[PDB]
């Protein structure tokens, strides 16, 4: 799959609460201010590091985002202190869940409609992203 950033598609917000970003963006937008992997000579943070490891889920809510139903998880890049990350998806978003693989929250669902196969998450389920090389099949 064509992933914006770490294991999400576009389509996707992202907000980390590592950031003053405590409300919604796109993966493209922050993909795009991350554009650079580094700015150690000007302003250090900016970095695909966030989730380098994975993002293990902590919690996970269903709600209606302007009229569209989401898939709504707070993820953990293993020390959530560096900050929550939450993100609003569709139902059929998959998600590379370590040990597992393809997993998803409709797996059925996210076959249909992404050509992938998924596997059922469970709330603790880390995702790992592009490039991991605990992500066996990406």
Request: net charge negative.
């Amino acid at each position: 799959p064509s992933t914006i950033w770490h294991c999400f598609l576009k389509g996707t917000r992202l907000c980390f609460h590592k950031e003053s970003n405590k409300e919604w963006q796109d993966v493209e937008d922050f993909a795009r201010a991350a554009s650079c992997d580094n700015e150690e000579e000007i302003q250090m943070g900016t970095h695909k590091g966030y989730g380098s490891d994975g993002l293990k889920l902590l919690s996970h809510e269903e709600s209606v985002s302007f009229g569209e139903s989401v898939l709504k998880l707070t993820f953990d890049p293993g020390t959530v202190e560096d900050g929550l990350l939450t993100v609003e998806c569709k139902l059929d978003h998959p998600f590379y869940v370590k040990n597992k693989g393809w997993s998803s929250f409709y797996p059925s669902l996210t076959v249909v409609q992404h050509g992938i196969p998924c596997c059922e998450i469970h709330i603790g389920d880390v995702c790992l992203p592009p490039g991991h090389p605990d992500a066996i099949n990406f």
